[PDB]
Amino acid sequence: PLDFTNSDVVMGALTKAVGRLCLDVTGYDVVEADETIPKPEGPYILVDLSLLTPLD
Amino acid sequence: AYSLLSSRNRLIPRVEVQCRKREWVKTDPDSPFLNGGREVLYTPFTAVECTVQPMRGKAIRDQNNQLMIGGEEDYDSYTVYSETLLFRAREGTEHLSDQMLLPDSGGGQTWFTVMKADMYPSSGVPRYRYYLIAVPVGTEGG
Amino acid sequence: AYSLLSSRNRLIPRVEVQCRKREWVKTDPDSPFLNGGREVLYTPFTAVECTVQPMRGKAIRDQNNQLMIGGEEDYDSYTVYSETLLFRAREGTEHLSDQMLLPDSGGGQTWFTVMKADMYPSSGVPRYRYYLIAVPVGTEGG
Amino acid sequence: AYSLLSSRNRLIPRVEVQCRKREWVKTDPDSPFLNGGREVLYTPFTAVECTVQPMRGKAIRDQNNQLMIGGEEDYDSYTVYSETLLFRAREGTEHLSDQMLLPDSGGGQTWFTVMKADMYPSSGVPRYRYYLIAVPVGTEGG
Amino acid sequence: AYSLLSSRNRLIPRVEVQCRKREWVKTDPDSPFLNGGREVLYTPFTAVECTVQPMRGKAIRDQNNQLMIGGEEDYDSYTVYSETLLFRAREGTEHLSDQMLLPDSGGGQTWFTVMKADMYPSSGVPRYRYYLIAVPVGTEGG
Amino acid sequence: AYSLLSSRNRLIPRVEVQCRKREWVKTDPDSPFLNGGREVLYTPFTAVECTVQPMRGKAIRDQNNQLMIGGEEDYDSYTVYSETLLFRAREGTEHLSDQMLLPDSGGGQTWFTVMKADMYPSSGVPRYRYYLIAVPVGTEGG
Amino acid sequence: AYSLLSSRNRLIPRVEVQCRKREWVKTDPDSPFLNGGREVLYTPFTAVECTVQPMRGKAIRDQNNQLMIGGEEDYDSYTVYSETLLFRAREGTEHLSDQMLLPDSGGGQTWFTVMKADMYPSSGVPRYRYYLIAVPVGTEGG
């Protein structure tokens, strides 16, 4: 009954948090690296989770 | 104007092949991304008559089974002459490249994705040449 | 002197194509730069008779749709034989390279920019060969 | 349809060769790995009629004995035309590439592993071309 | 000995072209350098009969207008067959390479500098082949 | 089966050449190494009839005298057609590659070491092609 | 055996050329080096009949005048067919490569050094092919 939010939930929600703030400020369009699509029209931003570091 | 080439051949055998068009769509309701949960929509069709031929050389990238650090991966390709019009992907749109189903070196059947299409707009006769690469095993391409 | 080649062919079909000349101009009143807000001026015209043909190989840079980190970009090219004179860009001037409209692999129509022009000044007959590259999708070249 | 090529030749001599299919299996009872102690299972067979030919150039990687920091290693290869169907490896399965026994430059006999197979699905006649590379001396390949 | 090639052709048209020899001189009175303020001296002349032809391929370095970080630069070249003797530069001397004026892809006329000259001393007939590269726009070469 | 090629030619002259087989042996009594003080044992013989030809190109590695930081070193090679069987080295054994004595560009005679041997097991006729490289001057190869 | 090629041609003109053999010697009395003050000894001679031809391509290293950071250097080369035997350098000796005097692109005459010699020991007829490179201007080679 003592539940929580495991790693998978936090990691996936961090991308969307970055995605919304980029859209809401710059006014550009957003896209991730996870799946490939034909290049959109107009300015846009690409998001990628390049690296991840643990603390021992 | 061309006359002989504007008609179907009567010496070399030709076969028909199956194909399928491809689009994509966004599924996630709240994700702010154009990608969302991408999905592909298919609509089948066939080519009137086609000729299939393999790569001519033996270059290391044209071999069928390739040794990688994971395991003996798989690769195939072809060159096709056809009288049907097939389209590649176009940017700023939701259309993807057409695919068509052909036999492979492992004895099965798999989908090949159109990569290069050749046309002669000034001649008039509808004869085309395509270059195809087999979809990665276990996926539906991109 | 050449006689047969100094006249129009009567066996191979030829077509006319549309073109357009290109200049550029500075618009910003106060910017100290030659660039300013660049603009291009067009003046249309047509080529008397032309023949269009595609690239012969299958080299990775000659394929139509290319996979980049952003998405499946687009590329096209041609080789054209014509009896009209078309010019490339010249430095220290305001003239840009001529462009001409031709069909593409995606089924549409787009502008191609002249990159290489071949001439035979010592022969006399006005027959030329050009090499063209499709303008990037969503822009008007440079 | 093809008629002459759908029958066996009557001018150029052809020979039969021996082959063997290959699978693999896991032996370790407690190891958590798909590899385990790998083993290969064989099932012999023969090709109806074949033609063997050597590499045409003299490129450094096509020479027979090669100088490495350890010692004069060994290398061989061939190109084979055959009317039997041989298969390469397929991923996500337990099947490996077929092998066939041929003479080598050292006077002995060794196994060659199929690497590239060419087929013409639209023609119909069962004529194939293969490219083979000799198994490393002292092992049974991979 | 050669007879037919020792006479002027009577089927293919040929044209004459203009040329100019080139030296150099030091002008600074006090500078200790061989360069000084370099100057070039010219002496015009003409070639008896010549044939001009363009480069055959489409390699990136043979295209006419090239994209650099500054702007769309200009480039041209030719291959010339002639019965006049033209000389390249010689070291330890004050002589430079001969130049000759030919039409370009931009519709104008510019000077081309001789880079490679071919001769057949053992044959006797005075027929030569040259390879030329257009002088950079806005300068007189080197 | 082949008939004409199964007999000796009667138009092109052919010559016989001398050869010698090569093994190796360990001499040091106490050294723990397989190498020890290596020695080579020879057993002479001759080839029935052979044809010698030089390399066709002019690539920098095929030139005879080469400029190195030490001095103008020496290099030679050939292509030989023969009806005698010659063997390359085989691993895990004490046999080395056969050698045969041929004239060189310096006017002398030196030993060439077999590097590539071509055979056609499915044809039957005993005709072979070899590629040879001259032993380094002052040594007996490896 | 060859008959026609064992006699001098009667259609294509051929010319004789001059040559000179080359050795070297040590002059310093006290220097401990094999080099000492090197000197070269010459002994002239001539070739019976020869044919001279230039390089066929236009590769950057085959052009006559080359642009270096110092100045427009000079380069020339040839391919020669001859019935005289000329030798390259041999190691562990005091003999150097033969040289022969031929016309150059600058209108003068200079010495060319033999670099590659081709022979057909199994044929018998004394016909050879050489490849030559012009000595650096201002020196006598090496």
**Closest listed residue to residue G79, CA positions, set E119, E83, E130:** E119
Q: Tell me chain G's radius of gyration from C-alpha atoms.
A: 18
What is the number of other CB atoms lying within 10 angstroms of the CB of residue F102?
21
By what method was this entry solved?
cryo-EM
Nearest to B115 by CA among B130, B94, B95: B130
In 3D space, the residue among D98, D107, D100 whose CA is nearest the CA of residue D74 turns out to be D107
Query: Could you write out the three-class secondary structure of E47-100?
Result: EEEEEEECCCCCCHHHCCEEECCCCEEECCEEEEEECCCCCCCCCCCCECCCEE
Whether residue F72 and residue G89 make contact (CB cut-off 8 A), yes or no, is yes
Helix (H), strand (E) at residue F77: strand F77-82
Q: Helix or strand or coil: residue E123? A: coil
| DSSP assignment of G69-100 | SS-EEE--EEEEEESS------TTSSB---EE
Q: Name the amino acid, one letter, at E113.
A: T
F24 touches chain D (CB under 8 A): no
* CA neighbor of E82 nearest in space, from E112, E41, E122, E107: E112
Resolution in A: 3.1
| HSE-CB for F68 with a 13 A CA cutoff | 12
| Mutation choice for B interface testing from C14, C46, C49, C65 by most B CBs within 10 A | C65
Do residues A39 and B91 make contact, with C-beta atoms less than 8 angstroms apart? yes
| B36-44: long-range contacts, CB 8 A cutoff, minimum separation 24 | B38/A35, B38/A37, B40/B96, B40/B140, B44/B18, B44/B19, B44/B20
Tokens matching residue C102: 């031709």
Q: How far is D19 from chain B (nearest CA, A)?
A: 17
Q: Which of F52, F74, F107 sits opposite G91 (nearest CB)?
A: F74
Distance from CA of E6 to the nearest CA of G (A): 13
Does G90 contact F at CB distance below 8 Å?
Answer: yes
Eight-state DSSP code of residue C5: G
- Residue G101 CB contacts under 8 Å (≥ 6 apart), including other chains: G17, G18, G19, G109, G110, G111, G112
Q: What DSSP letter does each residue of chain G carry, written as one string? A: ---GGGS--SSS--EEEEEEEEB-B---SS--SSSSS-B--EEEEEEEEEEEE--SS--GGG-SEEE-SS-EEE--EEEEEESS------TTSSB---EEEEE-TTSSEEEEEEEEEE--TTT----EEEEEEEPPTTS---
Contact call for C70 and A41, based on CB within 8 A: no
- Give how far Cα B97 sits from Cα of B100, B141, C136, F30, Å: 10, 10, 19, 71
d(CA E54, CA E104): 10
User: Would you call A36 and C138 a contact, using CB atoms and an 8 Å cutoff?
Assistant: no
CA distance C30 to D75: 73
As given in the structure block, the two tokens for residue C66 are 């290319």
Interface contact C142, partner E, CB < 8 A: yes
DSSP states of B33-63: SSSSS-B--EEEEEEEEEEEE--SS--GGG-
Chain D residues touching residue B79 (CB < 8 angstroms)? none
Q: Which amino acid is present at D139?
A: T
Residues F116, D56: Cα–Cα separation, whole Å: 11
CB C87 within 8 A of CB E105: yes
* Burial letters E35-55, b for 16+ CB under 10 A, else e: eeeeeeeeeeeebebbbbebb
**Alpha-carbon distance G118 to nearest alpha carbon in chain F (angstroms):** 6
Token pair recorded at residue E69:
């970080």
> Is-contact C56 B129, C-beta < 8 A?
no
Cα–Cα distance measured from residue C69 to residue E119, given in angstroms and rounded to the nearest whole number: 53
Q: With contact defined as beta carbons under 8 Å apart, do B139 and B40 qualify? A: no
Continuous segment of H or E residues that includes residue C19? strand C15-22
DSSP state of E4: G
Report which DSSP code applies to F121.
T
Alpha-carbon span D81 to F122, nearest angstrom: 11
Query: Is D30 within 8 Å of D7 (Cβ atoms)?
Result: no
Are C74 and B89 an interchain contact pair (Cβ–Cβ within 8 Å)? yes
Chain A positions in Cβ-Cβ contact with residue C69 (cut-off 8 Å): 33, 46
Q: How far is CA F31 from CA E75, F27, F37, F38, F91, in A?
A: 69, 9, 9, 12, 22
Residue E4, burial from CB neighbour count under 10 angstroms (0-12, 13-18, 19+): exposed
CA nearest to B31 within chain A: A16
d(CA B79, CA B51): 8
Q: How far is Cα F119 from Cα F84, in angstroms, rounded to an integer? A: 11
Burial C28-64 (b: 16+ CB within 10 A, else e): eeeeeeeeeeeeeeeeeeebebbbbebbeeeeeebbb
Angle subtended at Cα E109 by Cα E107 and Cα E113, rounded to the nearest 5 degrees: 130
Nearest Cα neighbor of D96 from D86, D85, D88 is D88
Chain F interface mutation, best of G5, G22, G119, G128, highest count of F Cβ atoms under 10 Å: G119
Q: Does C119 touch chain E (CB under 8 A)?
A: yes
How far is residue F97 CA from its own chain's centroid? 7
CA dist., res. E141 & res. F13, Å (int):
58
CB-based contact F49:F14 (threshold 8 Å):
yes
Is-contact F119 D105, C-beta < 8 A? yes
Secondary element (H or E) of residue F80: strand F77-82
